[model samples]
Target: GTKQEKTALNMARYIRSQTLTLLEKLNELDADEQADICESLHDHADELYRSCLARFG
Candidate 1:
């Protein structure tokens, strides 16, 4: 793969791992504890996408 492809793939894997970790944390949370992990995960995914785009595009 090209360097851009490699970077994108690595970013994708990281985003996936973060998503899974966020899910696990969410599952473990009580109602009140559920505060903002979902939002945080969303932000992380967005950042990954932007980073991938910057590196690839």
Candidate 2:
């Protein structure tokens, strides 16, 4: 049970790290890429927030 909980926490951390990396890449992109990546990241943010709320609530 403890190990399973740790795995879940680690997975959440990985997801957040990946999201931050994507945001950084988005920041580095040019206008068109920026727009595309921004849209993707916005979706990512929404999903992350909802998942977090569901898990923590």
Question: Which one is best on lDDT?
Answer: 1
Specify the poorest-scoring 10-residue window by lDDT in model 2: 1-10
Q: What is the alpha-carbon lDDT of model 2 when measured against the actual structure?
A: 0.65
Clashes of each: 0, 0
RMSD of each: 3.7, 3.7
Q: Please write out the lDDT profile of model 2 over residues 1-57, one tens digit for every residue.
A: 366655665676677567667666766775566657666876776676667546654
Candidate 1: tens digits of C-alpha lDDT, residues 33-53: 553666577677877776776
Tell me the lDDT of model 2 at 40.
80
